[PDB]
Amino acid sequence: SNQEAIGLIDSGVGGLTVLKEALKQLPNERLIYLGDTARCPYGPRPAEQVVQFTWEMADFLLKKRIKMLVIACNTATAVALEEIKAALPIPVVGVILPGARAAVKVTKNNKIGVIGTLGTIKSASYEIAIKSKAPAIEVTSLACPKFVPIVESNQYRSSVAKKIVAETLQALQLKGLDTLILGCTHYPLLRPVIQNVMGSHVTLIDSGAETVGEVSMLLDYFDIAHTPEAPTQPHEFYTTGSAKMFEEIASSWLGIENLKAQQIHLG
Amino acid sequence: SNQEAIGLIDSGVGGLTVLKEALKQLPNERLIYLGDTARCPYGPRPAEQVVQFTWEMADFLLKKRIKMLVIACNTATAVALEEIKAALPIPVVGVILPGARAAVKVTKNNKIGVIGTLGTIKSASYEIAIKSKAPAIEVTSLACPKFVPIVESNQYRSSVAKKIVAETLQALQLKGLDTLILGCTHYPLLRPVIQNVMGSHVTLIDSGAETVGEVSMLLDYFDIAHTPEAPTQPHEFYTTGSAKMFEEIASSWLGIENLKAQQIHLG
Numbered sequence: 001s002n003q004e005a006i007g008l009i010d011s012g013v014g015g016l017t018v019l020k021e022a023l024k025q026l027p028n029e030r031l032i033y034l035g036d037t038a039r040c041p042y043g044p045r046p047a048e049q050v051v052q053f054t055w056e057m058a059d060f061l062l063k064k065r066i067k068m069l070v071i072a073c074n075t076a077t078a079v080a081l082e083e084i085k086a087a088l089p090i091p092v093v094g095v096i097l098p099g100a101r102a103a104v105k106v107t108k109n110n111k112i113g114v115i116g117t118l119g120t121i122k123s124a125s126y127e128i129a130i131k132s133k134a135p136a137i138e139v140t141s142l143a144c145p146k147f148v149p150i151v152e153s154n155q156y157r158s159s160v161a162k163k164i165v166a167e168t169l170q171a172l173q174l175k176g177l178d179t180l181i182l183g184c185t186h187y188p189l190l191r192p193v194i195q196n197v198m199g200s201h202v203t204l205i206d207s208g209a210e211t212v213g214e215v216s217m218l219l220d221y222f223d224i225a226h227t228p229e230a231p232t233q234p235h236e237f238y239t240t241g242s243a244k245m246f247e248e249i250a251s252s253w254l255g256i257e258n259l260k261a262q263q264i265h266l267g
Numbered sequence: 268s269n270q271e272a273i274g275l276i277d278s279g280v281g282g283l284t285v286l287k288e289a290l291k292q293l294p295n296e297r298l299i300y301l302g303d304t305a306r307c308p309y310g311p312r313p314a315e316q317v318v319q320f321t322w323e324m325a326d327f328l329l330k331k332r333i334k335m336l337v338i339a340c341n342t343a344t345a346v347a348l349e350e351i352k353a354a355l356p357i358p359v360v361g362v363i364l365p366g367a368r369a370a371v372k373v374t375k376n377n378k379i380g381v382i383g384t385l386g387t388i389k390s391a392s393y394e395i396a397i398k399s400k401a402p403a404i405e406v407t408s409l410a411c412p413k414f415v416p417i418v419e420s421n422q423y424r425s426s427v428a429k430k431i432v433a434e435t436l437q438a439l440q441l442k443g444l445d446t447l448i449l450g451c452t453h454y455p456l457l458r459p460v461i462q463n464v465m466g467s468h469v470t471l472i473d474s475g476a477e478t479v480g481e482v483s484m485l486l487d488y489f490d491i492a493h494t495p496e497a498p499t500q501p502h503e504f505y506t507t508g509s510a511k512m513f514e515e516i517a518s519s520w521l522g523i524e525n526l527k528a529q530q531i532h533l534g
């Protein structure tokens with residue numbers, strides 16, 4: 001019921017960008033996170049495989065009785081959102097449309113860029129979403145396969161990351177974009193680097209963070225909000241990979257000392 | 268269909284405060300409005316009667332194939348939202364929760380006031396909503412029975428309106444409120460007067476307007492947004508009262524010269 005947790009799934013630590021913002025806007029909601037680290041990256045995988053893996057993660061949390069499911073993953077939202085939403089009795093939230101709505105609102109020169117995994121770009125989800133809202137906007141999409149690995153290796157602040165981002169985003173430097181969507185939930189971890197590379201005049205859109213606003217309204221629409229007090233059970237973090245590696249990134253990113261995660265199996 | 272209209276219902280011209288904002292944020296959505304002017308005000312009517320009338324209005328628009336129903340009336344939202352939402356196959360949007368979420372975010376001293384009809388205040392919908400989010404917030408509620416009549420009689424900018432608002436709102440003076448929810452959709456038509464009576468330091472919350480943001484995200488969640496182009500059919504306005512009286516107010520408030528309404532019957 002209303003006291004159950006909101007579940008969030010992703011290929012790894014990416015979904016944490018949705019969870020971090022949820023800790024801020026919805027401090028009284030209990031969260032259960034699952035990052036399929038063992039199979040990350042989902043980016044280059046075939047659509048049907050991402051759908052399969054997404055269902056496996058969804059099934060894992062459904063067992064935990066979640067009252068809402070957030071696909072805190074652009075790659076998975078692009079190919080699995082519609083199917084999962086139609087199948088489940090609980091609200092199912094994707095992260096693409098919230099980011100698309102936000103970018104459309106901030107652009108002044110109608111030049112919006114979108115960076116994401118090979119899978120998200122291949123699906124054209126962002127291009128399609130932006131066109132369904134404002135066709136006049138020129139959308140530039142770019143897949144950045146090298147970003148997730150450096151986030152997952154916990155080097156998103158290293159010199160290695162600064163060079164990777166600079167080289168990759170060079171393809172966008174001559175477009176004159178005034179807006180760039182971080183179409184991969186792993187990317188906000190590289191936000192300071194991406195911002196420096198793009199320039200102070202480019203507004204970055206954190207799609208995962210933008211989704212929390214929707215989650216908030218959906219809790220009211222479906223009338224399933226937690227009571228306005230701290231949950232009696234703590235947030236739970238699961239990963240198919242090393243709990244130790246996951247905790248080092250999560251603890252630092254979320255600013256939660258000694259955060260602990262559990263290694264589980266999916267298959 | 269994504270091309271059908273979004274319907275809005277209210278006791279009279281108050282719902283126009285939701286519609287006006289919809290024309291701004293959702294230019295490509297076709298709208299059908301119905302104000303039950305003949306039975307306005309709903310404010311002092313028993314809850315069961317308001318439910319009855321609200322269903323008749325909803326039924327009237329459902330017959331026009333609306334893809335979404337907006338109860339642009341706090342009085343009706345307070346007592347009929349739950350029932351209507353559970354019964355219809357289309358999204359049903361109330362104006363109370365959006366206003367409560369906005370108010371909670373803007374208050375600094377946690378002292379929020381809310382003005383509305385006798386019915387809205389009697390239901391305590393706002394008090395309950397705000398307490399369900401931030402119980403620390405002190406809510407001051409006040410029914411303003413004289414407000415709707417002066418809006419309906421097209422006197423909201425007259426000198427008599429200044430007297431009535433000041434006399435009525437004296438109950439909220441020196442209460443330390445830094446936020447006031449306009450909990451009746453007719454009230455935004457009296458905004459400048461209300462703002463002057465309360466201080467320029469008090470943030471006014473237009474619940475009806477706040478609801479449009481939710482409508483926008485719901486169109487995406489349910490994937491039923493109109494194509495990004497002006498609809499091929501114009502907006503429609505209906506009233507159970509004088510069309511001439513309705514158009515006089517509507518055309519002025521919306522800034523739509525020669526707006527035309529149709530008088531119809533409900534029962």
Ligand SMILES: N[C@H](CCC(=O)O)C(=O)O
Nearest residue numbers: 014041042043074075185
């Ligand atoms: N973090 C997910 C998937 C990243 C990946 O596994 O490649 C996304 O937003 O696209």
Ligand SMILES: N[C@H](CCC(=O)O)C(=O)O
Nearest residue numbers: 278281308309310341452
């Ligand atoms: N305008 C409606 C009802 C006003 C009335 O009929 O009294 C509301 O928001 O309360």
Ligand SMILES: [Ca+2]
Nearest residue numbers: 043117118145
């Ligand atoms: Ca990739």
Ligand SMILES: [Ca+2]
Nearest residue numbers: 310384385412
């Ligand atoms: Ca009243």
